[PDB]
């Protein structure tokens, strides 16, 4: 397929890999309804669709189209296949374990499906729970039962319990234990063979909040280490926390931000310490080149590189801290500007 430039012809995650692969200036084609210069990519996070946006071939030319990608039917790409561009186009396919995760607090639920490269929010449930009146607890109780019923209904439609290896329930208080009991009662009452088969796969965890970032708390929980440690999403949580442990020991051994990591790379500072983000997929060619180079640079020496997926909470967190960070091998003193807002 690949001489020296070319083209390639080729799971819902594979739409994501492609989103990363695609670049403005590229050309591709497949079936649609009525070959384009790629100008816009649009990934519906939820997550069937990939929308790619003019007509660069025969027309039985110079007018916009949009592709709306299919998942099993194939397509054809198109001059500079980057080292990054190639490690994704090569990743999946060829592939290799899905996880359901419900983060809740009292009137709040986040229903997530998690894979190696993706965390997707299937349902947010946000209901107002009236407070307990010191003489009356009805409005609270009725509000609480509507909520229990709501997440139940949601997971029961969102989750396919044959596919997932684990479904986690996590809350700060009693909600997650209350739910586990509620789920399986109702599923025994009504006859729901799907869930009753899956009881062994459910784990109930502590969590500080019912907000999504709480996902970095678990899936690092010891109780779930056994079943999950070989996943990308846990690997990202580890490294990030490894990064934090060092920040904590010596703030001269943990850098973050573009101008900081580059600087660190000019020195010998960089080691088991590339924490880099898929979100470096800019359209400016000049500025794509440098990240590919840096990753190549640390890769040609024997130091790990971690390209976090911007979809995970871990990855989101890495983005907030401008999407590069690095641990260091020695303590370095400096004072660099970082070029942002």
């Amino acid at each position: 397929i690949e001489k020296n430039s070319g083209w390639i012809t080729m799971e819902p995650e594979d739409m994501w890999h492609l989103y990363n692969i695609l670049q403005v200036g590229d050309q591709l084609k497949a079936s649609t309804v009525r070959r384009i210069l790629v100008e816009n990519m649009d990934f519906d996070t939820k997550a069937a669709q990939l929308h790619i946006k003019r007509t660069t071939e025969y027309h039985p030319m110079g007018s916009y189209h949009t592709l709306d990608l299919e998942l099993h039917r194939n397509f054809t790409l198109y001059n500079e296949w980057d080292a990054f561009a190639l490690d994704r186009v090569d990743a999946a396919c060829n592939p290799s374990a899905e996880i359901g995760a419900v983060v809740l607090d009292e009137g709040l639920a986040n229903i997530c499906l998690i894979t190696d490269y993706m965390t997707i929010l299937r349902q947010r449930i946000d209901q107002v729970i009236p407070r307990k009146r010191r003489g009356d607890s009805s409005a609270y109780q009725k509000g609480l039962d509507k909520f229990y019923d709501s997440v139940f209904q949601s997971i029961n439609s969102e989750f396919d319990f044959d596919k997932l290896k684990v479904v986690i329930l996590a809350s700060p208080g009693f909600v997650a234990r209350g739910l586990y009991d509620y789920i399986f009662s109702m599923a025994v009452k009504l006859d729901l063979k799907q869930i009753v088969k899956s009881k062994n796969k459910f784990v109930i965890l502590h969590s500080s909040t019912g907000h999504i970032h709480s996902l970095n708390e678990i899936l690092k929980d010891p109780a779930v280490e056994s079943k999950l440690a070989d996943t990308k999403y846990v690997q990202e949580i580890r490294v990030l926390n490894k990064f934090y442990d060092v920040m904590n020991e010596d703030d001269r051994k943990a850098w973050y931000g573009p101008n900081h990591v580059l600087k660190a790379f000019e020195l010998g500072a960089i080691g088991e310490l590339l924490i880099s983000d898929s979100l470096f997929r800019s359209s400016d060619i000049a500025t794509r080149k440098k990240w590919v180079s840096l990753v190549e640079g640390v890769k040609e020496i024997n130091c790990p590189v971690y390209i976090f997926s911007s979809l995970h909470e871990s990855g989101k967190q890495l983005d907030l801290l401008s999407g590069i960070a690095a641990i260091l091998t020695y303590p370095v003193d400096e004072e660099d500007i970082s070029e942002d807002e």
């Binding site: 107002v128 009236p130 407070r131 409005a139 500080s208 909040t209 907000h211 999504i212 970032h213 708390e217 934090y244 442990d245 920040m247 904590n248 703030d251 973050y256 967190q317 907030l320 801290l321 401008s322």
Partner: protein
């Protein structure tokens, strides 16, 4: 597509008719063995001649914090080395981190050290070095008052105590009376916080506080959060009177007419369309940091805790101890820009409205900082 009310032709907040005194808000801190508890009781008792409420010719609603105007620490006279070392120390830190600038320090039980002025000065120092040197209080906002909770200099200098041999200052009550509260908050634009929301007969009921301004029956309230409005159908002020209005400081239980229940959530602030509350995506804040494990990085995700609203935010560093910085460690001031991860939230500057501008920051389960909002974006 929506169409605003508008207002009726009704009354003006006629609070002033019945000559009211400013209601000043306190939090009272101190060890269990400072006479903190006796001091309050003795104030109740002596004002007895002539949540805890004392009036003089101001009115002191004292409360707890573990949103309010001033504070006092009280402590005691024993073998003083070790304590000062409780978690009254952390209380002092918290109050600074939040708005509070003025403390009164009740120096209790000097009668037990025979009203010795050298003892009062000794302890004034140990305390001044913690409240001033180590925590950010100005010397001129920390007032010291000698006392005996088992009747002292709290109400009347009308003691012929050995104390008034050397001591020329005010009584505790007078030291409190010299602290200037916010001018006339019942006049400032209306801010009403929502504590709870639930359906009723021909109204959605809301309960909460009048954070500033005033509110009366048959008026229009605006909810910046759901972009919706309502008619006040009833107002239960403090007790359960046949009240028809409420003013800044009163807890309220309202009944709202032309609004549906789901368009009104705890943590919302309602107001008039005139000088409405502003909902923002991000703000600037002066936080102050506590004992924390890892430092707060610029870009960190924390959970902000304001009223009933607790929500996920990211914090970007502007400056730390007035210098540019890449991390904010324990026991440090910082100017920061905080962004909500979950949409637009309504708030005020702490200048305008403490209870609406003072918040707490936490990381996983640990609280790591507190601050005041200084700017809206």
């Amino acid at each position: 597509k929506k169409q605003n009310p508008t207002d009726l032709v009704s009354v003006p907040e006629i609070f002033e008719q019945s000559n009211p005194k400013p209601v000043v808000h306190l939090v009272v801190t101190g060890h269990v063995d400072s006479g903190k508890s006796t001091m309050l009781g003795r104030i109740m008792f002596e004002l007895g001649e002539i949540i805890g409420d004392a009036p003089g010719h101001r009115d002191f609603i004292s409360g707890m914090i573990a949103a309010v105007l001033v504070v006092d620490s009280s402590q005691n006279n024993f073998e003083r080395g070790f304590l000062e070392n409780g978690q009254t120390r952390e209380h002092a830190y918290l109050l600074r981190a939040l708005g509070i600038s003025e403390i009164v320090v009740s120096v209790n039980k000097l009668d037990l050290m025979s009203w010795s002025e050298d003892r009062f000065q000794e302890i004034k120092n140990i305390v001044s070095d913690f409240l001033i040197k180590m925590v950010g209080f100005k010397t001129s906002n920390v007032h010291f008052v000698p006392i005996s909770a088992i009747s002292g200099t709290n109400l009347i200098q009308k003691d012929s105590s050995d104390l008034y041999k050397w001591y020329k200052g005010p009584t505790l009550l007078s030291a409190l009376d010299q602290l200037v509260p916010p001018e006339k908050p019942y006049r400032k634009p209306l801010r009403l916080s929502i504590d709870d929301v639930y359906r009723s007969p021909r109204s959605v009921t809301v309960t909460g506080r009048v954070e500033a301004g005033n509110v009366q029956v048959n008026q229009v309230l605006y909810d910046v959060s759901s972009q919706e409005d309502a008619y006040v159908k009833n107002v239960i002020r403090n007790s359960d009177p046949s009240s028809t209005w409420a003013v800044a400081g009163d807890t309220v239980t309202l009944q709202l007419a032309d609004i549906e229940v789901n368009q009104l959530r705890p943590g919302d602030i309602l107001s008039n369309y005139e000088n409405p509350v502003r909902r923002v995506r991000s703000f600037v804040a002066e936080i102050q940091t506590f004992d924390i494990h890892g430092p707060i990085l610029s870009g960190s995700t924390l959970v902000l805790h304001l009223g009933r609203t607790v929500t996920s935010v990211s914090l970007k560093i502007v400056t730390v101890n007035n210098k540019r910085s890449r991390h904010i460690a324990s026991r440090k001031r910082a100017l920061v820009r905080i962004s909500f991860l979950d949409g637009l939230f309504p708030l005020c500057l702490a200048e305008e409205c403490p209870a609406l501008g003072r918040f707490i920051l936490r990381r996983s389960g640990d609280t790591v900082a507190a601050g005041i909002v200084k700017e809206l974006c």
